[PDB]
Write a protein that binds this ligand. Structure first.
Ligand code: HEM
Ligand code: HEM
Ligand SMILES: Cc1cc(N)nc2cc(-c3ccc(OCC4CCC4)c(CN)c3)ccc12
Ligand SMILES: Cc1cc(N)nc2cc(-c3ccc(OCC4CCC4)c(CN)c3)ccc12
Ligand SMILES: C[C@H](O)[C@H](O)[C@H]1CNc2nc(N)[nH]c(=O)c2N1
Ligand SMILES: C[C@H](O)[C@H](O)[C@H]1CNc2nc(N)[nH]c(=O)c2N1
Ligand SMILES: [Zn+2]
Lengths: 411, 417
């Protein structure tokens, strides 16, 4: 256990990490094998209180009332409540604190300079899929804000016995359908082929277009999930056009403005919130590099490069790289022209470096996953490429969880 | 402690199974509670390996060698072991056979987790220079290496291995970080002429007596240390230094930037570790991936930094980042680099071809060897990461021996005569 230095090899700034000593969860690495590029490496009454205590301790530390009378009483209150009921309920203040710090601790998120501006919607009183739909509609409307996007999270009731889980079966609140074609190719988003088929199996009548917004598939209290249509006036979309290539609009592309991830698990003080959709705004490469140009995604690189009359016979002409830049120029230009919040990867990584300085100064460190922070294009011409980073696991945290259709027992 | 580890390719869904990690030797710097995968170097000169330290390291290497030639447990294996054990017992070190030197050099490359070019690992020309005694002799060896590896533009990978460390006060060192590098000169007004990466080494050469041309692309002299003596300066014969003028297939004006680069990347400041023996002077060379020149050598802010001037000549809007003018310029610079090498028939590989080859290599190594240590942070190219197949490939990073290692710069440790 020592202070660890991280160096920026471009600015020669050296930061000293003390926060990693507070980490208690594991990373997946060992002294002998590093698993930094593995995507997914690796409760009862008895285990719950220490986890609760650790979180309550840090909550009262954060508000400069550690050891105070209310700190004492809250610990005695949580211990007694776990005794009698095998669980406990978070105060509203603790819920907000926990949610913001889960975002603050998300080592893979380049957007964390914004972490303390998070609108937290408490939905722990929800009991049915219809109520989930209401809460989700309100979240989408608030977060969208006519294009002036606002970060938000909506937190549904925590897991109890594991048989009554609340789940949003969608991976994002807003995504486009994908259809397995007769010949074998894909109409729409190939990332959502399985989920789309589930919705059709569940009664959804698919328009079978290239940009069909998917219905919500919502599971309350462990019951069978139910389908809902997001009111279309709440779904903000940007048609993608290019500022110089007049033909780009003829590609017929568009995307949605609100990135709202809804399949992750929020963990606070030992409690597990299996339904907790959270939303911010996009970095342009999320759409223009990954969602449009991945092999198993929309894969428009070939067509764009053709329209640019590029030499596509050899890889060394870098025709993919040229078309990739133009696609990302069009995405940024399109969102900005419609006044929908978006950030480019130069600005976002610049902000993250500034964020890192803040966290080392006030918190003693910032867990960061270089593999995920560095953008998927033009990596070394962003400031994070040359920034050393220490990755470690703090709680409260967002965690992965299995897709519900693998675990659910239909009634 | 499970015996098998799985890695997944999230683009193709191929799953590979790693058992080779069981043979990892030294620490990564990571723990179960922290990952140091993005730290550049996560893990006294006279402090050399002792007898009791050297015995197991030699045995492990000899065993691995005789296993690779399908002679494990043979009479030759046992006799080699006994011979090595008696050398260490009576001389505190031992000498590798030529076969073992060659095997060990090829395998340090095969084990280099940060190298994307390892599909070529078994095609490495090994030059045994362990009979060298003086810096003039090192210069002779290095000149021959350069000429052989350059091969009039049809580049061939090669390593030259000088005598191993003994007591730590008689080290052979190449003080250059690469055999061919351009000088950098800091001006009184703070600006830099030439290559900013090499200002410190350039200043050392000048102090040692080098008369610098004070140009933009001045090939640096070799600064060579034999047997722990003070290092000596030599000029590489310019006819041995193959260079490529950088021009662009569509932009007439690109040649007017006056850019060029050298054909042969030849890293000369690393240490080669084989069976506990330490080869502190072991320059090795291959051929370039274009982005090593076009992204890092030209566009890094602390390097040649020509993004601005290119973007101006392209008449891009440079007043806001969201126009991606930097991204546009970077692609064209890398187009020019590849077109220039190809037009001059100098071997080079683009980052699409290189990463596709590495994936095929990595799958073959999992199949035949049981794994392939790979450092994602270094394997993924510095531009267009996610449109190359390595971006979506999970990797396991661990340290196998024989290995290439970092070592301290020699001017920080050398005891001047
Ligand atoms: C406000 C603007 C935000 C921006 C620009 C942003 C940007 C990003 C990006 C680019 C990624 C990588 C995405 C990918 O590669 O597909 C990411 C990951 C992530 N973000 Fe943020 N984000 C923002 C807000 C938020 C918010 C509000 C939360 C939660 C309250 C959050 C939590 C996360 C998590 C949990 C991950 C991934 C961690 C994992 O998969 O293990 N982000 N973010
Ligand atoms: C044959 C063509 C080769 C290609 C295309 C190639 C490519 C590369 C690249 C692109 C890197 C990362 C460089 C950077 O980002 O600065 C690298 C690193 C490396 N390569 Fe290769 N390489 C080749 C040959 C070789 C040979 C012949 C050897 C040794 C015999 C070697 C050993 C290494 C090592 C030790 C490293 C980096 C390890 C470190 O710095 O920690 N490579 N290579
Ligand atoms: C709030 C927010 C804003 C934003 N601008 N971007 C965001 C991106 C993610 C995100 C990215 C990748 C992920 O991993 C899944 C990969 C396998 C296929 C993609 C996950 C985990 N669901 C989340 C999560 C939240 C984001
Ligand atoms: C045979 C070969 C061919 C090739 N095409 N490329 C090669 C690149 C390296 C290499 C790259 C980066 C390195 O580290 C540099 C960091 C310190 C500052 C940045 C080192 C370590 N000297 C070696 C080594 C050998 C190479
Ligand atoms: C295999 C690799 O770890 C995986 O593809 C990761 C790499 N880095 C990433 N980085 C971001 N931001 N998003 C991703 O989906 C990924 N994928
Ligand atoms: C901070 C970071 O680890 C460092 O800048 C690394 C990142 N990855 C790299 N990858 C390669 N191939 N070469 C490099 O020089 C670097 N630099
Ligand atoms: Zn690690």
């Amino acid at each position: 256990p020592r202070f660890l230095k991280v160096k920026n090899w471009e600015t020669e700034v050296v930061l000293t990490d003390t926060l990693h000593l507070k980490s208690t969860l594991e990373t997946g690495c060992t002294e002998y094998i590093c698993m930094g590029s593995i995507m997914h490496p690796s409760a009862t009454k008895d285990q719950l209180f220490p986890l609760a205590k650790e979180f309550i301790d840090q909550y009262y530390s954060s508000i400069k009332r550690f050891g105070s009378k209310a700190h004492m009483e809250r610990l005695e209150e949580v211990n007694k409540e776990i005794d009698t009921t095998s669980t406990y309920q978070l105060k509203d203040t603790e819920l907000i604190y926990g949610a913001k710090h889960a975002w603050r601790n998300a080592s893979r998120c380049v957007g964390r300079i914004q972490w303390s501006k998070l609108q937290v919607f408490d939905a722990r009183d929800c009991t049915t899929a219809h109520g989930m739909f209401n809460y989700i509609c309100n979240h989408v409307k608030y977060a969208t804000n006519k294009g002036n996007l606002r970060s938000a999270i909506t937190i549904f009731p925590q897991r109890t016995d594991g048989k009554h889980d609340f789940r949003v079966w969608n991976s994002q609140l807003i995504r486009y359908a994908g259809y397995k074609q007769p010949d074998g190719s894909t109409l729409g988003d190939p990332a959502n082929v399985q989920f789309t088929e589930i919705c059709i199996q569940q009664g959804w009548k698919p328009p079978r277009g290239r940009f069909d917004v998917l219905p919500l598939l919502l599971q309350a209290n462990g019951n069978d999930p139910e389908l809902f249509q997001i009111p279309p006036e709440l779904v903000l979309e940007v048609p993608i056009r290019h500022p110089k290539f007049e033909w780009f609009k003829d590609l017929g592309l568009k995307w949605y403005g609100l990135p709202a991830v809804s399949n992750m698990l929020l963990e606070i003080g030992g409690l597990e919130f299996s339904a907790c959709p959270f939303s911010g705004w996009y970095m342009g490469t999320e759409i223009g590099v990954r969602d449009y140009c991945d092999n198993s995604r929309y894969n428009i690189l070939e067509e764009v490069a053709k329209k640019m009359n590029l030499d596509m016979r050899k890889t060394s002409s870098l025709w993919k790289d040229q078309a990739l830049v133009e696609i990302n120029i069009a995405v940024l230009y399109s969102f900005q022209s419609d006044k929908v919040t978006i950030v480019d990867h130069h600005s976002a990584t610049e902000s993250f470096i500034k964020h890192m300085e803040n966290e080392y100064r006030c918190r003693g460190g910032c867990p960061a996953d270089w593999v995920w922070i560095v953008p998927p294009m033009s990596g070394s011409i962003t400031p994070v490429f040359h920034q050393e980073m220490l990755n470690y696991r703090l709680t409260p945290s967002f965690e992965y969880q299995p897709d519900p259709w693998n675990t659910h027992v239909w009634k």
